[PDB]
Every structure is written in C-alpha cells, then in structure tokens.
Subunit: 312 residues, 4 copies
Amino acid sequence: TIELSIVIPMYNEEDNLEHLFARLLEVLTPLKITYEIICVNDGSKDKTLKQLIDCYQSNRQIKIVNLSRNFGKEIALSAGIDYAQGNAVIPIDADLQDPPELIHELVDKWREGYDIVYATRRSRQGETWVKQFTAKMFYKVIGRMTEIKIPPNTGDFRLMDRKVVNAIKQLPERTRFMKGLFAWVGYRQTFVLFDREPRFQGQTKWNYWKLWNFALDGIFSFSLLPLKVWTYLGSIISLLSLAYASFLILKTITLGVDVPGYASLMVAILFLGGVQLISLGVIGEYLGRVYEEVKARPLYLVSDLWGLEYLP
Amino acid sequence: TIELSIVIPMYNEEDNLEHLFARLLEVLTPLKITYEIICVNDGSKDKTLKQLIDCYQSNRQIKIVNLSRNFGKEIALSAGIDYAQGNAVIPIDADLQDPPELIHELVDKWREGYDIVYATRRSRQGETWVKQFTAKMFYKVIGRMTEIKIPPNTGDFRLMDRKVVNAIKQLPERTRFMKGLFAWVGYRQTFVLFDREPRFQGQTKWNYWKLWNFALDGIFSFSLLPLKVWTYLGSIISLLSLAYASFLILKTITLGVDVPGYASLMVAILFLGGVQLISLGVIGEYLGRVYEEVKARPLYLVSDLWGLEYLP
Amino acid sequence: TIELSIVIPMYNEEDNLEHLFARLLEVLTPLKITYEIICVNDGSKDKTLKQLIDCYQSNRQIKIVNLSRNFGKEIALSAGIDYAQGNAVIPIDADLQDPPELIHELVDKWREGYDIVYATRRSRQGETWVKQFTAKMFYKVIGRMTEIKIPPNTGDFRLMDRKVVNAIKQLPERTRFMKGLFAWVGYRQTFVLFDREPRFQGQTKWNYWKLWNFALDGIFSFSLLPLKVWTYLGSIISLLSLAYASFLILKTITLGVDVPGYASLMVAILFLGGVQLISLGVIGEYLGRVYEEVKARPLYLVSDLWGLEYLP
Amino acid sequence: TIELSIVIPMYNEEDNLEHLFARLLEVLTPLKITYEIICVNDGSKDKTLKQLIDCYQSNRQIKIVNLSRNFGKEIALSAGIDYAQGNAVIPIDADLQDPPELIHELVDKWREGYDIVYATRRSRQGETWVKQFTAKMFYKVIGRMTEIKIPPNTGDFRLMDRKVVNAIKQLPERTRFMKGLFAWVGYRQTFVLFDREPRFQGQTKWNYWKLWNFALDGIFSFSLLPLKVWTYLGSIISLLSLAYASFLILKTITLGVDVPGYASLMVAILFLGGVQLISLGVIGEYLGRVYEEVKARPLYLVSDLWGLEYLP
Ligand SMILES: O=c1ccn([C@@H]2O[C@H](COP(=O)(O)OP(=O)(O)O[C@H]3O[C@H](CO)[C@@H](O)[C@H](O)[C@H]3O)[C@@H](O)[C@H]2O)c(=O)[nH]1
Ligand SMILES: O=c1ccn([C@@H]2O[C@H](COP(=O)(O)OP(=O)(O)O[C@H]3O[C@H](CO)[C@@H](O)[C@H](O)[C@H]3O)[C@@H](O)[C@H]2O)c(=O)[nH]1
Ligand SMILES: O=c1ccn([C@@H]2O[C@H](COP(=O)(O)OP(=O)(O)O[C@H]3O[C@H](CO)[C@@H](O)[C@H](O)[C@H]3O)[C@@H](O)[C@H]2O)c(=O)[nH]1
Ligand SMILES: O=c1ccn([C@@H]2O[C@H](COP(=O)(O)OP(=O)(O)O[C@H]3O[C@H](CO)[C@@H](O)[C@H](O)[C@H]3O)[C@@H](O)[C@H]2O)c(=O)[nH]1
Ligand SMILES: [Mg+2]
Ligand SMILES: [Mg+2]
Ligand SMILES: [Mg+2]
C-alpha cells in the first residue's frame, strides 16, 4: 500500500527536476513510510517529459500523468489527486518555492488526528502592501461567504487525508472555487505556519486581468451570495420605483399636475423599470436554484460511522 | 431485519442523551419489534460524540452517523434516513419536545394501512398572533402550491414507510422543500394529533431572517408557481403597453397630436418596455423548463404492482 | 414472449371495466397472439382498484400498475409504457372512446413494416368551426416546430413498436411533449383513419387552463423555436434602436437641435433599450443552449444495423 | 483488430456508391491494413439503403448504420464514429469531393506519431473574395476562443486516433461545435494540405440560413467568451449610465440649475437602465456558470500514463 502521495504539477520545468527530486528524497526517506510521487506533466512545450521518463525508469517511486493539453495548475493538481493512491495527498510545486521539509511537519499533524492540514505563510513579506490589502479584503469576503473560515495565506501546498480526497472527488463540479470547496468539505482542519525561503520573494508580475478572473471565479463559481445581494437590492429599487410611481399618479390626479403638460413619461418609465426589475429578480432567484441543482453537491458528508457500513 | 428506525439528529446534545435514550427504550420495548436507533451527530462542537460512542458500545441498537461538519437539522435527518434500514423510519428530536410515547400511536396507524403518518400538534398553545396568522397564510399558500394538502401543525416527527423512504431517496434534488416533497409523494397519508409537553414554551426568539429565508426557499425551491404567476402578469402588462403604444401612434397620425411636440418618447418607452417584457417572459418560461428538468424528479411513482416486477 | 401490450390508464373508471375488458377480449382473441393488458390506476378515489384486482385474479393477462398519486393521463400512459414488455404497445382509453376493434387494423399496419401507427379520426364531427380552426393553427405551428410532419387529428390511441418504445425511453426529459417526441424520434410512421362512435360526439367541455397549459407545453417544452424567433425579433429591434439612436446623435451634432432642447432623452432611451435587448438576446441564446443540453436527448437514434452490434 | 475505420455519412447518395466504393478499395488495399467502412445512412428518402445493403452482402468490410430519420451530416458522423472500432477513424464524404488517396498521406502522418491529422484545403480558390474574407474573420474570431489554433480551411475529412475518439466520446455535449471540440481536447495535432476535386469547386450555393445557424452554433455552443465579453461590455455601459445619472443629479442639485424643469426623466431612465444592466450581467455570469456545469466536460484529458492504470 501507499501511505503518502506527493502530487507535482509541472509545466516547463527542466533543470528543476534533479533538485526537486533530490530534495524530495532527502525529505521522504526519514519518514520510513511507503510513498509515491505523481508528476502531472501539464502539456509542457518543453523538453521535460523526456527527463521525467528518465527519472521514472531508474526510480520506482515516480509515476507520470501526461495531460493531452495545457489545462492549468489547478486542473493538473486535480488530475494528479484523482490518480493519487496514498492515504494522504500533498500537492507540491516543482519550483520548490514551498520547502519540502515541511512535509514532515504536515505528516506529523496528519498523525495528530487532522484531515486537512494547510501550509500557511507566516506573512506575505514581499508584496507591496497593495496585494496584501486586496488579499485581506478578498479573504474576509470569501470567509463571510463560507462557514469554515478557511485560513488566510493558504496556497496549494497542504495535506489531504484520503477521506478529504474522496469527499473532493465526490463533488461533481466543473466551475470549482477550490478554497471554497475545501471550506465546504469541513473535516478536522488545521494549519502549520512556514516561512518561504528568502530568495523566493516578490518577483512575479501580478497581471491584474488573471487576478480579476480569479476574483470573479471565487465570487461567482462558489456561492450565490453575490446573486442574493442582488435581486434583494433589486426589488428594493423596484418596490421603491413602483412607489413614487403610484405616488406620482396620485399627485397628478389630486393636485392636477400639468406643470410640464407631460408627466406620464415618468410614470411609464418607473412602472416598466420596476416590473422589469421584479422579472429579473425572479429570473435570478430561479437561476440560483438551477445553479444549485446543476452543481449537484452532496447533501451531506459522513466522516465516521459507528455500527453502520458506508453507503455506496 | 429491522422493523422500525428512530432517526435522531443531534447537535450539542450532551446531558440530554441519557434521558432521551431512557425514554426511547421505555417506549420501544413494549412494541416488541426489532428496532434500531440512528444518531446523526451534526458536527457538534460539544462533548456529545464521546457519550454517543459510549452508548453505542453499551447498547447494540445504537448506530452513529458522524457528519463532517454542521449541515443543519434537515440535512442531518436526510443523512440518517438514507442510512436507516428499517421498514418504517421515524424522525425524532433529541430535545424530547416531541414525546416519544407517540411512537406507538404512529406505529399503530402505520399498521392500519397508511404509508406516511404525520404527527400534528392540536393547537399552537404559546405562539402569539404574529406567529399564528403568518403560519396559517403560509400553510394555505403551500396547500394551493401542491395538490395533496399536507396537514398543518406538522413538524419533523412522523412515520415514513420504506416505500415512502425509497420514493424520497429517488428525488436527487439539492434544493428541497421537505413539506412539499412529502406532499409530492402522494402515498396513503394520515395524521396523529398530539399535545407538546408544556415543559418548553412557544416564546422562542423568531429570527425573522431565518423564517423569511425558509419561507422563500419553500416558495421558490419547490414549484414554478411564482414564476408562472409572473411572465403571465408581466406579459399581460407588456400587451397592455404595446396596445397603448399603438393607440398613441394612431392618435399621433390621426388627430395630429403635436401639442407637446415630443409624444414619441412615450411611444419608444412603451414599445421597448413591452418588447423587453416579452423577452423576459420567454426567458422565464424557458428557465422554468430548465429548472423542472434539472430537478430530475421521477415522472411517476408506482405504489403497488400486480402481475409485474418492479423496474430496476 | 408477449407480442402485444395494451396500456389502459384509469381514473374513476369503475362501471366501465366490465365493458372495456369484454370488448378488449373480443377484439384480441381472434388475433391468436400472446398479449398483456397493463391497467395503470392513476390514484383513482373510486373503487376501480378493487375491480382491477378482481379482474387480475380472474384473468392472467391483466396486470396492474397502481400509481401512488394522481399524476395525469400522460404520466399514467408513460408508466404503462415502461412496464409493458410486448413487441408492440397500444395505448387505449378505458372509456372505449376509441374503438378497440381498430387494434386489428393497427396490428396489420404494424406487420406491413411500420414502427408507429397512429389512429387518426376522419373528422372532429362534434366540434364544427372554432375548435377545428384553433387545432389547425396549433398543428401548423407544431408542424413547423418539427421536421417529420406528425399526422393531424391524432390522440393517444396508437401502436408503437418496441424500437420506438425504447427510443422514447431513451429520452429522460421531465418536460415532455409526447406529440412532438413521437415525431422527433421519427421511424417508419403511418396512420389509420377511424370513425369515433356516435356516443362520443356530444358537446365537450374545454377549460382554457388545461388546454392553455397543453398549448404552452407544446410551444415551450418541445423545442427552442419560440426562443429562436425571439432573440431575432428582439435583436432586430435592438439594432433598429441603436440605429436611429446614432441617427438622432447625428441629427443633433449636425443641424443643432434647439427644438425641445431636452431631447436626446430619446437617445438614452433607445441606446439603453437596445443594449438591454442585446443582453436579453445573449442570455436567451445561452439559456436555450442550457435547456437543450439539460434535456439530454440522444444525438442520434440508430434504427437498423448491418454487420455491427448495437451499442450498450 | 481493425487498424482503420472509414466513416461515410450518406444522404440520397445513389449513383455515387459504385464510384466511392471503387476508389476506396483502390486506395485502402495497397495499405495492407485491415480496414472497415461504416456507411451511416442518414434517413435518405431514396434507394441508397437498398444499394448499401447489396454492397454489404457483396463485401465483408462494409457495415451499415441506419438512422431512424435524417439527422444531419455532423450527427451522422457522430453515429458512425461511435460505431467505429478501428485504431484510426477517417471520416469521408460520399460525393468524393475530398480525394480518398489523401487517406494514405493521413495514415503516414498517423504513423509519424500525430493523434489528429486534419485534411485542410490548400486554398478556397473558386469561391468569391467576400466569402473567403468572412471565413477568415470567423476563423480569427474562433482562434481566440480556442486553446490550440486549429488549421485554417479545415473540414470533416480528417484522421482521429483511437485516443482522440475516446476523448471526444468522453464529452457528453448535446450542443457540440466539433471544430472547437477537437481543439479543446487537443492532442498532438497536425494537418495535411490538399486540393479539392477538379470541377467540384464552383457549384456550391451557400444557404445563408444554414450558414447563419452553423456560425451561431460555433459562437454560442462552444465557448462562454461571447457571453463574458458582452457581460463586461454591459458592465461598462451600466457604470457609465450610473455615473452620468449621478452627475446629472449633481448638476440639478449643485449649481441649482434645472433648465427644462423636467430633466428628472433622464436620471430615472439612466438609473433604471443601469440597475437592469447590472442585474442582466449578474444573470449572464451565473447562466454561463450553469452552462459550464451542464456541459459536464471532464476537467482534464490524459494522453499517456507511466506507472499508473487509467481510471474507469
Ligand atoms: O499551466 C501551468 C501548469 C502547471 N504549473 C505548475 O504549477 C507549479 C507552481 O506554479 P507557479 O505559477 O510557478 O506558482 P509560483 O511559483 O508561486 O509563482 C506564481 O505567482 C503567481 C501566483 O499565481 C502566478 O500567477 C505566476 O504564474 C507564478 O509566477 C509549478 O510546479 C508549475 O510547474 C504552472 O505554473 N502553470
Ligand atoms: O444545526 C442543527 C443541527 C441539528 N439539530 C437537531 O435538531 C433537534 C431539535 O432541533 P430544534 O432546532 O431544537 O427544533 P425546535 O424545538 O423547533 O427549536 C428551534 O426551532 C427554530 C426553527 O428551526 C430554530 O430556528 C430555533 O433554533 C429553535 O427555536 C435536536 O436533536 C438538534 O440536535 C438542530 O437543532 N440544529
Ligand atoms: O388524471 C387522470 C388520470 C387518468 N385518466 C385516464 O385517462 C383515460 C382517458 O382520459 P379521458 O379524460 O376520459 O379522455 P377524453 O374523453 O378525451 O377527455 C378529455 O376531453 C377533452 C377534449 O375532448 C380534453 O381537453 C380533456 O383533457 C379531457 O376531459 C381514461 O381511461 C381515464 O381514466 C384521466 O382522464 N385523468
Ligand atoms: O442531411 C445530411 C446527411 C448526410 N450528408 C452527407 O454529408 C456528406 C458531405 O455533405 P455535402 O452536402 O455533400 O457537402 P458540400 O457538397 O460541400 O455542400 C455544402 O457546401 C457548403 C460548404 O460546406 C456548406 O455550407 C453547405 O451546407 C453544403 O451545401 C455527404 O457525403 C452527404 O452524404 C449531407 O450532406 N446532409
Ligand atoms: Mg428544538
Ligand atoms: Mg375520455
Ligand atoms: Mg459535395
């Protein structure tokens, strides 16, 4: 059997494989447990699949999942986790930004009785106080969308129990906010604090288009809260628009409002706008219902059973 | 085999387990049938799981379903019923607000030939007029929503035959209105009147946000009637607007209306509003069809078969 | 092996069972083939079930499908079709409105090489002008909806081969229009003309709610053509508003408009209406895509195979 | 084991069976590989099926898939590919517009390692400049929507390896734009240039309705990019409308200048339009998420594996 699985999504990672595998060998041999390394080649346009083949031939603990195309880090991680067989699964980057030694600490927490063990940075320490603030506000927003309070500063480096992996695969989903989904599958969760290596500091171009795309997926692909905040703002600006339209009709009828000579335009505008806003609100509520239905999340998740066998 | 399955959703229920189990045993032993008790620990932060494990170790009829986190009473009950194997499932509350002595009565009615035996309070006896009038109107609205007339004053205390349990498990809906769903499975149903124990009161704080969210969920996640009343009234409004626009157009050509000099903003407003209202109505009708399809409700439900074997 | 299945939906059909079964046996005995009679009791409040059980005890060819609730004649017919194992299934009415003797003719047509053999009335007879006009208009609409030209004056009385029954069972859509579904799955189809009995030619009641809902289902639950005639008429209007909004912009920036200075109100009205109509068109197009995706109809329907085995 | 499958969709293709079936055997037999011809009779209202059955009796390699009605070229190709068991599936047209000798070249490129070998026309040639420009613009628009740039001037003549065929069958879409699906699943693709048959160029009168429907299927049934682009565009228009409404409120409050005395109409119009556009944008974003969920494409596609077995 396999106790630990290390999932490494790789995309154009030559000359990083030797160092990464040396570090993983330094880390995983003291553990004295059976492990495996699932390398997800995410359709690289670079001579790295050949080096992965060379490493796999000599080393019996390397398994390779070669994706047909380039799907992205999250999808490659999902593929590796689907193909992982260990009792615990640890996603790890191929650039060694997250130190592999923390695996041991993570594994220790896994033996303490926890199911998901996140690996959180002590602090950002390299962002220009704009990314820190935006991340803090966004994380408060999603935490108010969630009900598990996913720890801040958590990346993809973590440890999953087999129960959590099975629960994640139990969620049939195509638009997945992975942090929100992890919060949704609420098992015994914890985190361990680690400091990223000082060389690995702020050097990435935080292109705000993909950051905004990630924000939109987090806001919309996870929860209906942005859809329920609207259609509640709407039908308030619609009930308040049908009002002051009935009020306008009453004022015109009683006072005899013909100061312009044309006051039915405002009444028509307000009435049609309010009716259309109510229609859009009803459509939004039923679209949220359809979204919940098509997400097809399980009603519940059983963590343990005493005296009962697991339902298939 | 198991004849009866008592499903108790439990959340922070320590110091209530001893009394509840004593009453359950005192009620179930005279029945002289092979019963089972399934306790669904709904992610309690309290120390009830240890006591549940101890009682499962002592009593062999106790079974524990440990949900990953807190999913709510409804989802905990669904999880317990899914794991219930008895010929009749009785959902009960661990607070003993529903007297377990009624179970015998329910079973008696279940042996009379009925499939669903609800437990209904005779009178509210403790709730003010603001929680009686609203309840009454909500029940009339729901009764007009369905075609089976769910008896009023009904809680989760009930008896469900294995036929009804399998019928309910055949609904894969994620947005569930339990009262409407149980009305929808139109088996042979009846009620048993009982008086709630005067130990607890009806002055419980009404979190009207919750009593509005649940009401709107039952209204919106059960039937399409709110979406059918609109896109009908809305389409009627659109037809009236277009008729008024045509009449105004005529009154502009014949009779030569030029008194304001701009009696065409009204025409454009009315025409565009009517066109958008028809578009919204068509979108709403098709969204309703999409919702009915994604709910994936079975077309029919076979109660009994003579000369035939049940389809897979 | 069963050669013929006769599916009879029943609802308060007591006192017709004796005559119906007598006529059915008189018709079916000369055919000299094995047959079954599936009586689908649609949750009748009458004593129909007792007589059905007695007949099933007396006659071995009678099977009963007792639906739990009153689902409707269409859903009862569906429940009968799924539970019918004959090589050719004939839906018929328990009131003997359609003469059972036509079974013989249908069988001959089925043995000529046809897959669906409709039973069409020669004329409406009873109804004179209004019902015929409305039916002709509706049938023209639904004929332009599909591409297989279902014969007119058709009811639920027909013969369907096992191939057609399986093809229909390959459509797991809850919002179903059977008159259109039997055309969409088009096989070798034909019809036979039958003259309804003089008994069943009296004045008929037509509540314009069941008929109205039938028309709405035939319009919106069959295809996207009602949604595709709009999103074009709603988009031509949007284009014709954005144009002439540009024309008013030009007629204001050239030939400086001091004629009611508070013009360009119409520019805003037209521009916002056109943008909203383009939005409504885009949402309508994608909603139709979602609708036909959710319906999950098979892409094709193989009728015969030479040199190949049928796909599982 | 069949090393090559030739799928031929057919509709009213008589007087073309002998020529096609002579050229196909003139081409395939020199390859000395076990081939298989699968003729999908797409509901021809013609004697095509009888001659196909004659050829099926005559030759052991021709198999027939008969569809219940006329479904179209793409659906017939899907049916033929689903019934093809060869290691490489080569769709082909029965009118022989694309030379069958190119199959040899295709097979060579299949032996060279490539998974999808497109057969692309060298140039459109005969058709006019405006048609070529429209096709080029459409392909340029699609290229951004895709992930791997599909070769220009592609058709239904191609070679798909068994890997790619299994990947495409894994896509349970009902709204399939195949030219985009073959780029989404993108394996090791390549293309082979060829010229269409002489005298078979300048006789195609384009069906503007059919071309429009195909283009709209490509735009709307493949990607959400048009939806997201228009949602963004509506968001900018809504923000501009709200900002201009606020500016008008200022100008009518600050500076106190109300010139007409009836300019609240524009504020109401702008504000209601902006609110409705925000609501429509939210509805569109959630409809796109529902569309992505409903399409149910697999997150990833595995091409090769090392050390692991393929998941079921
Ligand atoms: O399409 C893919 C598929 C897989 N991986 C793998 O993902 C791991 C780490 O991904 P990476 O993007 O390098 O994360 P960081 O090293 O922390 O830096 C990132 O910092 C930003 C935060 O997401 C990203 O936008 C930048 O692309 C990237 O420099 C590595 O093993 C990669 O091989 C990718 O990066 N892109
Ligand atoms: O999130 C959960 C999960 C499980 N249970 C179980 O449900 C049973 C009883 O449910 P309870 O909520 O106490 O029923 P009520 O007696 O009707 O009291 C509640 O009824 C209201 C309507 O739900 C609630 O809003 C209030 O918390 C409370 O007054 C108990 O075994 C609990 O353990 C809960 O109550 N809440
Ligand atoms: O809810 C149900 C369930 C089953 N059946 C069975 O369906 C069979 C035939 O139905 P029936 O209503 O008797 O046929 P019609 O004589 O055509 O009655 C119709 O006559 C009108 C036009 O002729 C229609 O518009 C109405 O739907 C309906 O009243 C009968 O054996 C019934 O038992 C019903 O009628 N209603
Ligand atoms: O309903 C059907 C079913 C099957 N096939 C088969 O599809 C193959 C190729 O189709 P075909 O019509 O012969 O292609 P073209 O001769 O190129 O004609 C097309 O030329 C344009 C460029 O593709 C298209 O836009 C037009 O729709 C169409 O007239 C043929 O073997 C047919 O048998 C059809 O054409 N129509
Ligand atoms: Mg309680
Ligand atoms: Mg009748
Ligand atoms: Mg041609």
